[PDB]
Amino acid sequence: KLFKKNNQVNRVDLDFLNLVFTLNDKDLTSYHAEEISKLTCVKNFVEEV
Amino acid sequence: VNKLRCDRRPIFGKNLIDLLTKDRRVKYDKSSIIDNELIKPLQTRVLDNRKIIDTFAVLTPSAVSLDMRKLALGLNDDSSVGENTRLKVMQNCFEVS
Amino acid sequence: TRTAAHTHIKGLGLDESGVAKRVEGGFVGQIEAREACGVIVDLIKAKKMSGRAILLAGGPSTGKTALALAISQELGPKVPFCPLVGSELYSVEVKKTETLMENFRRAIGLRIKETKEVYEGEVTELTPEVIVGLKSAKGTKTLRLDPTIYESIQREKVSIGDVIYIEANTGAVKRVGRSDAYATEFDLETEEYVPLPKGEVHKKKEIVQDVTLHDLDVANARPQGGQDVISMMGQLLKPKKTEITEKLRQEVNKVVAKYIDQGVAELIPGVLFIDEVNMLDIEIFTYLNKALESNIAPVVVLASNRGMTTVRGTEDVISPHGVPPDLIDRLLIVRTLPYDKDEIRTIIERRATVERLQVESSALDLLATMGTETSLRYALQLLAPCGILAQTSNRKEIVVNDVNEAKLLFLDAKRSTKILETSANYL
Amino acid sequence: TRTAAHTHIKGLGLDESGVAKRVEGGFVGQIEAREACGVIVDLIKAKKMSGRAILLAGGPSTGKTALALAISQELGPKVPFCPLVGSELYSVEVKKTETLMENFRRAIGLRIKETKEVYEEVTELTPEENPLGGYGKTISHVIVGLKSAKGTKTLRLDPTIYESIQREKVSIGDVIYIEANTGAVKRVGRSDAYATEFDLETEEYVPLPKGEVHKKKEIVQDVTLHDLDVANARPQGGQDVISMMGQLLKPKKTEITEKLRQEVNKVVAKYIDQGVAELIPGVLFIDEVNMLDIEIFTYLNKALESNIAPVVVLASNRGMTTVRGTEDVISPHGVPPDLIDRLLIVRTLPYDKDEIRTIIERRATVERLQVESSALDLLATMGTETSLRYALQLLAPCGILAQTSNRKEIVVNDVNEAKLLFLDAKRSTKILETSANYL
Amino acid sequence: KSLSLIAAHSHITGLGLDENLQPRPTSEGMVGQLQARRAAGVILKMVQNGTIAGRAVLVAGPPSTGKTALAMGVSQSLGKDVPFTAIAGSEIFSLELSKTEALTQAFRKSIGIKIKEETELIEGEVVEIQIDRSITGGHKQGKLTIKTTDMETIYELGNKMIDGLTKEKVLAGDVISIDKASGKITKLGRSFARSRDYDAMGADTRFVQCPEGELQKRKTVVHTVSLHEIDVINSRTQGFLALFTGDTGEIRSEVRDQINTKVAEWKEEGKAEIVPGVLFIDEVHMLDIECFSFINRALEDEFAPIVMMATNRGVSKTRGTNYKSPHGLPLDLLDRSIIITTKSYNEQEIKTILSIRAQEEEVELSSDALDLLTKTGVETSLRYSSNLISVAQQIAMKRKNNTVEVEDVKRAYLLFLDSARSVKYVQENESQYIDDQGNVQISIAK
Amino acid sequence: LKSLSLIAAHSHITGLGLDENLQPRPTSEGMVGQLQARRAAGVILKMVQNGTIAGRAVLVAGPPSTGKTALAMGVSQSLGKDVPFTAIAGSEIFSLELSKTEALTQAFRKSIGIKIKEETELIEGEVVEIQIDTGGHKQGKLTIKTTDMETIYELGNKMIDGLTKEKVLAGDVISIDKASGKITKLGRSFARSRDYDAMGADTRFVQCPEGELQKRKTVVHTVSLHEIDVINSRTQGFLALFTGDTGEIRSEVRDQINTKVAEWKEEGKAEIVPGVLFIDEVHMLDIECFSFINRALEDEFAPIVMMATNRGVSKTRGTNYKSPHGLPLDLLDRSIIITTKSYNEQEIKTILSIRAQEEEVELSSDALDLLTKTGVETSLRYSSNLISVAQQIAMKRKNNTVEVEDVKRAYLLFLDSARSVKYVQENESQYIDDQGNVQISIA
Numbered sequence A: 001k002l003f004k005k006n007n008q009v010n011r012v013d014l015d016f017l018n019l020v021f022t023l024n025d026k027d028l029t030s031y032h033a034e035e036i037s038k039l040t041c042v043k044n045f046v047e048e049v
Numbered sequence B: 001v002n003k004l005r006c007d008r009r010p011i012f013g014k015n016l017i018d019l020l021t022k023d024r025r026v027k028y029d030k031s032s033i034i035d036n037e038l039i040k041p042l043q044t045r046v047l048d049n050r051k052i053i054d055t056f057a058v059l060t061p062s063a064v065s066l067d068m069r070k071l072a073l074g075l076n077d078d079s080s081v082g083e084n085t086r087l088k089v090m091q092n093c094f095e096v097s
Numbered sequence C: 001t002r003t004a005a006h007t008h009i010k011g012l013g014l015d016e017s018g019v020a021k022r023v024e025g026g027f028v029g030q031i032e033a034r035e036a037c038g039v040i041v042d043l044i045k046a047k048k049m050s051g052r053a054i055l056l057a058g059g060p061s062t063g064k065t066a067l068a069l070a071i072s073q074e075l076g077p078k079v080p081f082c083p084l085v086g087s088e089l090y091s092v093e094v095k096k097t098e099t100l101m102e103n104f105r106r107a108i109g110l111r112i113k114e115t116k117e118v119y120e121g122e123v124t125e126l127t128p129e130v131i132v133g134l135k136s137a138k139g140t141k142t143l144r145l146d147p148t149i150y151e152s153i154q155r156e157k158v159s160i161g162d163v164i165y166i167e168a169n170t171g172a173v174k175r176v177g178r179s180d181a182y183a184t185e186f187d188l189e190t191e192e193y194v195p196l197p198k199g200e201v202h203k204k205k206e207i208v209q210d211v212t213l214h215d216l217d218v219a220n221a222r223p224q225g226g227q228d229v230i231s232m233m234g235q236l237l238k239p240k241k242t243e244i245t246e247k248l249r250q251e252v253n254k255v256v257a258k259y260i261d262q263g264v265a266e267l268i269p270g271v272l273f274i275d276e277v278n279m280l281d282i283e284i285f286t287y288l289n290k291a292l293e294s295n296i297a298p299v300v301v302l303a304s305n306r307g308m309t310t311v312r313g314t315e316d317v318i319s320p321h322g323v324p325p326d327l328i329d330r331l332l333i334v335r336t337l338p339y340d341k342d343e344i345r346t347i348i349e350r351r352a353t354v355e356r357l358q359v360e361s362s363a364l365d366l367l368a369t370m371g372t373e374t375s376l377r378y379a380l381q382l383l384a385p386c387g388i389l390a391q392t393s394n395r396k397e398i399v400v401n402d403v404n405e406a407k408l409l410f411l412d413a414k415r416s417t418k419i420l421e422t423s424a425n426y427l
Numbered sequence D: 001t002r003t004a005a006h007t008h009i010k011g012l013g014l015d016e017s018g019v020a021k022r023v024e025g026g027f028v029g030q031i032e033a034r035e036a037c038g039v040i041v042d043l044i045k046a047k048k049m050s051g052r053a054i055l056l057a058g059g060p061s062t063g064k065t066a067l068a069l070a071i072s073q074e075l076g077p078k079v080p081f082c083p084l085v086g087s088e089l090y091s092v093e094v095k096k097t098e099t100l101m102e103n104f105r106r107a108i109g110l111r112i113k114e115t116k117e118v119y120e121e122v123t124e125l126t127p128e129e130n131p132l133g134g135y136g137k138t139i140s141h142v143i144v145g146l147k148s149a150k151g152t153k154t155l156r157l158d159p160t161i162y163e164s165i166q167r168e169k170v171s172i173g174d175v176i177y178i179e180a181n182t183g184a185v186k187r188v189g190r191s192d193a194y195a196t197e198f199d200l201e202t203e204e205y206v207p208l209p210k211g212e213v214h215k216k217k218e219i220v221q222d223v224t225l226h227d228l229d230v231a232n233a234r235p236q237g238g239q240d241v242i243s244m245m246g247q248l249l250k251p252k253k254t255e256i257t258e259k260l261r262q263e264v265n266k267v268v269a270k271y272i273d274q275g276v277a278e279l280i281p282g283v284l285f286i287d288e289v290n291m292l293d294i295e296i297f298t299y300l301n302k303a304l305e306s307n308i309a310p311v312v313v314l315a316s317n318r319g320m321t322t323v324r325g326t327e328d329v330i331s332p333h334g335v336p337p338d339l340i341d342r343l344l345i346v347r348t349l350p351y352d353k354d355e356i357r358t359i360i361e362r363r364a365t366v367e368r369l370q371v372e373s374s375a376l377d378l379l380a381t382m383g384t385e386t387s388l389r390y391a392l393q394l395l396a397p398c399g400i401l402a403q404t405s406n407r408k409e410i411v412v413n414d415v416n417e418a419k420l421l422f423l424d425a426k427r428s429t430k431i432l433e434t435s436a437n438y439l
Numbered sequence E: 001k002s003l004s005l006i007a008a009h010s011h012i013t014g015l016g017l018d019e020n021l022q023p024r025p026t027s028e029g030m031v032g033q034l035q036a037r038r039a040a041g042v043i044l045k046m047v048q049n050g051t052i053a054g055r056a057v058l059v060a061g062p063p064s065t066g067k068t069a070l071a072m073g074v075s076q077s078l079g080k081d082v083p084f085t086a087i088a089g090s091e092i093f094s095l096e097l098s099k100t101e102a103l104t105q106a107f108r109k110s111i112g113i114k115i116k117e118e119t120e121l122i123e124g125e126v127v128e129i130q131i132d133r134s135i136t137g138g139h140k141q142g143k144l145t146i147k148t149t150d151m152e153t154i155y156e157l158g159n160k161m162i163d164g165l166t167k168e169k170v171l172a173g174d175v176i177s178i179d180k181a182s183g184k185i186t187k188l189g190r191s192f193a194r195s196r197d198y199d200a201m202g203a204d205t206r207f208v209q210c211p212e213g214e215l216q217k218r219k220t221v222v223h224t225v226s227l228h229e230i231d232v233i234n235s236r237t238q239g240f241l242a243l244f245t246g247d248t249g250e251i252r253s254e255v256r257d258q259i260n261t262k263v264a265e266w267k268e269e270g271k272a273e274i275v276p277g278v279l280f281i282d283e284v285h286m287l288d289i290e291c292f293s294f295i296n297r298a299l300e301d302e303f304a305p306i307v308m309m310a311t312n313r314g315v316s317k318t319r320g321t322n323y324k325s326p327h328g329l330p331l332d333l334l335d336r337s338i339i340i341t342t343k344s345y346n347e348q349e350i351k352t353i354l355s356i357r358a359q360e361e362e363v364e365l366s367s368d369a370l371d372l373l374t375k376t377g378v379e380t381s382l383r384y385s386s387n388l389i390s391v392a393q394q395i396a397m398k399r400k401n402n403t404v405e406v407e408d409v410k411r412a413y414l415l416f417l418d419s420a421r422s423v424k425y426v427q428e429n430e431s432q433y434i435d436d437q438g439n440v441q442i443s444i445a446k
Numbered sequence F: 001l002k003s004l005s006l007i008a009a010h011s012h013i014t015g016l017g018l019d020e021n022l023q024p025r026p027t028s029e030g031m032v033g034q035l036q037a038r039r040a041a042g043v044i045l046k047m048v049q050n051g052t053i054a055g056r057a058v059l060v061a062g063p064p065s066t067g068k069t070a071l072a073m074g075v076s077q078s079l080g081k082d083v084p085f086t087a088i089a090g091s092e093i094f095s096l097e098l099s100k101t102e103a104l105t106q107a108f109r110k111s112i113g114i115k116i117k118e119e120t121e122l123i124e125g126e127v128v129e130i131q132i133d134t135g136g137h138k139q140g141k142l143t144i145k146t147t148d149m150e151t152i153y154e155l156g157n158k159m160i161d162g163l164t165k166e167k168v169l170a171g172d173v174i175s176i177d178k179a180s181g182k183i184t185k186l187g188r189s190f191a192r193s194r195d196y197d198a199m200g201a202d203t204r205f206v207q208c209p210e211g212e213l214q215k216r217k218t219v220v221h222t223v224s225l226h227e228i229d230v231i232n233s234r235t236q237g238f239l240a241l242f243t244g245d246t247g248e249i250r251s252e253v254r255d256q257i258n259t260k261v262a263e264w265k266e267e268g269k270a271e272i273v274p275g276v277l278f279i280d281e282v283h284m285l286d287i288e289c290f291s292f293i294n295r296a297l298e299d300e301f302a303p304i305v306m307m308a309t310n311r312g313v314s315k316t317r318g319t320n321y322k323s324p325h326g327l328p329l330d331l332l333d334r335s336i337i338i339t340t341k342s343y344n345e346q347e348i349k350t351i352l353s354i355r356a357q358e359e360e361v362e363l364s365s366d367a368l369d370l371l372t373k374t375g376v377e378t379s380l381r382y383s384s385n386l387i388s389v390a391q392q393i394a395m396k397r398k399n400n401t402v403e404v405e406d407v408k409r410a411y412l413l414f415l416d417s418a419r420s421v422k423y424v425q426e427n428e429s430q431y432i433d434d435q436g437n438v439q440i441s442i443a
């Protein structure tokens, strides 16, 4: 109780920044990766932002 | 989100599941039929030795402390494990033969 | 009827006045050693002091281990006992000092009593939460029980109409079988029908079993008797022996002190015996100084047939009996004397008698002369081949010619060494 | 309010333009060493160029550890600082070189920034159906409401978050904060609004949060890559098989591979290129390095030419000794000559009577004690006659003796009795050589 | 409590001193060593003050001269609430833990921390328990009437409390205490009330408990823990089991520094109190040079308890080296440590100690027997007589006389051998034993 | 672009200053002098990219600070990508959880790379609409859509079951394997992008794919042999490449996977690439390791192994004789020696100037000459370290240039190795000897 009280203040989610990547291996390929990371970066969100 | 979690990991680097399947793939149709008795899996070995284990397992512990057998795997009425995780543990493990 | 170098020692044979006779209890000579050993016997029987140290030192073939076995037998089985050899200390799973402490805690016993509650009867119904129904010869009760033993019963393939046995204290579940009331249901059924138990389902009994402190410590640290999946699944994960924290020992000491203070148990000190302690390392030897000067450590006895030697683990200090002066200062020394001709002859004839062999007097004289010439253990070893050699000629007695033939057939240390000295290629 | 031979050193006491006075920062004498070490602090604070080493040599009781502590104080609490001794490198779990590599990675830290939008009693909750497929049953939508303080607001979400909050076992009337990044929500507790619902309860009263329905906060985190790669290698999770196994696995650290190092270096490189992360090189301290070995020294060279090598500082007091592991190699300070060629050497010198007397004055002042002038003057006498540290330690028993006879100050006969009571090394070995009773 | 038969230091009880730190010539079960006693009392006062950390003190002298006796005396005079760890030199050479790791664990063991947790606890005798089911009107029904010595009232459930009370088969009419901050039922015993119906429990409840009357009480709980327990708890999922089994396995350092910072925060906030425990190491000459090097740095930290060491040898070869260093220790440690010397005993002191052992061991000593025992002790050693006194008892009531006499002492002396006599016999009988070169003369004849 | 480096001890080295016929330029890419060694390194390099003969042992000699590691860094930069280059020192071979022979075998398998080609056929982001139905085995035909292409596809009971797991509205765009694999969620369309007041980490708005969804694309895959063995070492060992618990893999995966890679090579779908394994600090090693290397040089998949050392005739770690070069004669017999001479004053000047400009340090000519004079007196690394501290002290004096007096102050601040040795010689009593003797009492 005296220790697990500042987790509501100083906690930082390394998983949110994708720093636990080793555990996220066996579900992904790259043909969607580069295509989406470019298209959503420029052309999908130019009409939205 | 687009600049943090859009595609960060699906870029290979370390590995990709399809590559593991391509590598862990198998080029065997059927072999080792005599798995029968040539290999004799230990699951059959234990039951094949039923009579001797009935006739020889005699010793018993001299002392035992209850509430540690259950506490060893970290599940008690006051434990740090989750709500449904503890029940799912033996729900997956009780079906074990 | 196996006999091996012992079992002819039935005790020290000490008088109630503390004066040892000449020949008694399968023992001859060593009057001073036997008297001191009986004094130590009464010392441990007092059960008032702790952490006392006695070392007995003497040359080989002087019955030092025989004396230790004699005192152990004289004490009886009530007192805990654990023989040890120095080389057994060195292990690879745990540090040597921890093994020494483990053997320290196994050398004191505890006599305890508790009430065992059991429930046995016929299986009547199984209502899930878990309630069970038991039928006895005359009684019948319904019991609500933890789902763990319910699942265990399921694993125990218990059917309807069966008879089971339950230990309430530990939750132990065992099925006796099925009642003979419903027995001849099948012509060739594999299940063995058993008669219905007689008496009430609820039963209470008393036990007086005994345990040592090391057993309590390992039971508390390591549970190795579980029945449900979680129990043995957890206990198979760490098979390797580990260390034991001292705070666990303090907690165990507190609980046993509470048990004896309440008045349902009493403490029994014991004896720890280490044979051939000359080879022990220096670290263990300096650890003994701390271990002995404690409040619970039992009495200890050491054996070492050495002289001006360097103790193992160092290269400088030459100490008597391979024990440094620091451990010597907290030590009592017992001197063992070498035997002589007539005692040798008596030993040989007694060993022959305990081996149910017939021996002719001239053969005993030859055996005694040869034993004085080489060693007592040599003759003790070779007497049985003499017996079989006589048996080959269908004679139940021992003749001098047979003994000479056996001595020709089997060598000794001195003859083998002389042959080795004059040998072509280190024969 | 306690000290152990230190904590009276407040920085290095180096003024602007790189100058050190006599008495400052609890530090006296050895000006040139302080100047050089301040220059080293400047070089580290440049944060431009990394991979250097510096070894300082001197006799015992010279202030080497004090010098390193002054360095650490001057740098400040932002840059990481990992003190160490040679012995801790040895281990019974992994290689010596490997442990050196964890320490190497632990020396350098990284500060990361990130903003988070969070939504924070609960007005109501309601799911919204026909799955139009083979699925059994589901809800098209879920609509909930949050009370908070700065006005309330309803919230529409997916039955996944409904499932998650159901797993959190939260009452309908309760205070809830929900994470917008991934949807993780935990039971904040029984809110203060529904106080004394019954006569007796156990749930925390949890006063209702004062703020908007949704709040955005800025979080700045300082971590080292050593935390990063062990976090990457160690598995996580709940009831999954490897999760329980690791929970029971006794997670001993074992031989972190270089592939994780490459991956984390790439990720942090692209993050600092993006401009969200800033890398703060640290300094690693190895005290009493003579206890190391040839293997450690050679791998130390190899790691010293590495890419992300932090600046390290070494301490020793040995002379023309033989480095451990071998016997034919006699090298200064027990450091192999090839390593010596790869770093600089800072000299330190023994103090004088005046400097020792000033040290005694400072040490007496910090512990709130009164020392008579003559008593302090004589304390300096056997400070020089025997050692500085002996006279430094002698002070507290003298204070106790002063407490015995109810006098705050310390007198000459008190310290004389203290010296008589407790022996120094020279007197002790004199008694040892004189006697023959195993002493 | 503290079950024990007899200890080699069962007679020493917390040193002996005045308010002026002057040792009495005989106090609390020991005699002599005036200057050593005064130094030990000084160190004790240091530990009580708690404003100093990381000081090294070494006790030196001939073997069997009040070294471990002084250690036990300071341990007993220290009393409870101040951690004291006595460790031998050879307990750290483990294959599971590195030597520096074990030394670190011991140092963290010898650091006391006092904490105070405030909880609102309600106790009192109950009459019955009301646990209802879920119905249309509301969640459940519950109305507990609780009685005490003074005044009896009634309370209501809290939804979760039905489950808490149904977890165990709580019998109606027992003294159970509830802390609403925790909700833990403390079934200390049954309701005393009137013992006419409660006179034949068959043991149980330990004579129950008389109700205290008032119920609304908030009493602070003082808990004493050491740094090792905290870090071990933080290390694993269930650190308490590792603490009780010893499989910690090289706890990581960043946990330790975080613990240090956080406990410093608690100290500034007034939540925690720091107790300067004591670490004691015996026959430290058996330690390795790596351990000494690690100690040299670990001493200077602020979280460094006072460490006391005792050795026996002098001018010996430090383990791990080849040079016979003075005192069997590295010179730098001798510089950083303070040496306490113990001198040889006197015949009067040895006779007083023997009499103390006699009265301690329920041994009645005749004056002539005491004289003979003192003569033997001064001739050979203290421990020889200190064991002969115990052994001669068995001879005393083997002749049915409770009080020991001269003849029993003579018999014990002639029955059990002394080191000098034993070595003389061994030297005169060298051919009978096993030589250092494996030369044995088993054959009596030829 | 991906240079997270602050600096490197030798970061000016970017390849080797050679040409078409492999002539060493006098100064190119942080490299000066030792032309014969550079020509030999270029020959070895051309041999490596020839990739037609394996199992060659090359040894680099030279005094300390002669730049033997500089050649290794240069050749590593020259080969660049697509070829593995394992830089391993001699100390990490000593593991107490793995046999030294096993560690050497792992290193050898690491240095060999293999690339393979594989082609997958898939329809991406086209599942538009689900038409559930009569009853049972419903949704047997639903259309597919992209931003530019649409098609109607019939669905069977097996595909119905596949769609049942993680059912979706199908108004989004989802990629499903046309190669008889499974389905993979892509995200949500823009129509429901404004449907949630809170977000999670399961589904993210995804663009409708451009062009035909059907695509049979081929992918190349590069990996080294050590990883490919460890992946088949157990049921799953992807953590072994990360955790590091290889576990001393038994010699059954190795030969079978050699046969597998030979089969793949004969099929032509896989191409091998022999990398270079470099071992620095070789003079400390066990004789057993030397014999294992002696044998392993003969293997068909033996990468080019390059060794570096500086010790002359000295005892070998594992024997009792002072062998020349610190190595057994057997290993020296089957190796190639490339000696490196010392460095010259002009070379010293060029190297110091390169170092100074590397850390963007403005240097006065006279200060550079003083640094060159010192680097002639003492080691060159001494001045190459003093440059930065001289810059720092010049900054503290508020002058951008590194004046001579700043360099002299830096020199006077830090002791030379020889100067430190001499001072220790003058003050032997003050320091602690190797016999544990020291003096702290001044009087």
Ligand SMILES: Nc1ncnc2c1ncn2[C@@H]1O[C@H](COP(=O)(O)OP(=O)(O)O)[C@@H](O)[C@H]1O
Binding pocket: C005, C006, C008, C009, C026, C027, C028, C029, C030, C059, C060, C061, C062, C063, C064, C065, C066, C067, C305, C347
């Ligand atoms: N008094 C005795 N009575 C019977 N057997 C004896 C006697 N003394 C010695 N022995 C025999 O001598 C042998 C030597 O005993 P032990 O102590 O084990 O070996 P050692 O004396 O060489 O240490 C034993 O086997 C024992 O049977």
Ligand SMILES: Nc1ncnc2c1ncn2[C@@H]1O[C@H](COP(=O)(O)OP(=O)(O)O)[C@@H](O)[C@H]1O
Binding pocket: D004, D005, D006, D026, D027, D028, D029, D030, D058, D059, D060, D061, D062, D063, D064, D065, D066, D067, D317, D359
């Ligand atoms: N100039 C100084 N000012 C204050 N304290 C000093 C000074 N020099 C040394 N000390 C004291 O000396 C101790 C450090 O000794 P140090 O020189 O590090 O020993 P070693 O030479 O064995 O490393 C510190 O506790 C510090 O209080």
Ligand SMILES: Nc1ncnc2c1ncn2[C@@H]1O[C@H](COP(=O)(O)OP(=O)(O)O)[C@@H](O)[C@H]1O
Binding pocket: E008, E009, E029, E030, E031, E032, E033, E062, E063, E064, E065, E066, E067, E068, E069, E310, E312, E353, E382
């Ligand atoms: N002042 C004393 N009073 C009573 N007994 C003492 C005293 N000094 C020593 N002893 C006796 O000596 C023994 C302790 O010996 P010790 O000096 O600790 O050995 P070492 O010098 O090897 O540590 C104890 O059993 C104790 O009975």
Ligand SMILES: Nc1ncnc2c1ncn2[C@@H]1O[C@H](COP(=O)(O)OP(=O)(O)O)[C@@H](O)[C@H]1O
Binding pocket: F009, F010, F011, F030, F031, F032, F033, F034, F062, F063, F064, F065, F066, F067, F068, F069, F070, F071, F310, F351
């Ligand atoms: N011929 C050279 N050209 C460029 N730089 C060199 C040369 N020789 C040495 N160096 C520099 O010297 C530094 C150390 O050289 P190194 O290879 O470690 O010496 P050694 O041969 O003793 O290992 C390197 O950072 C490198 O920049």
Ligand SMILES: [Mg+2]
Binding pocket: C061, C063, C064, C065, C066
């Ligand atoms: Mg024997």
Ligand SMILES: [Mg+2]
Binding pocket: D061, D062, D063, D064, D065, D066
């Ligand atoms: Mg220091």
Ligand SMILES: [Mg+2]
Binding pocket: E064, E067, E068, E069
């Ligand atoms: Mg002692």
Ligand SMILES: [Mg+2]
Binding pocket: F061, F062, F283, F308, F309, F310, F311, F312, F325, F326
């Ligand atoms: Mg070389």
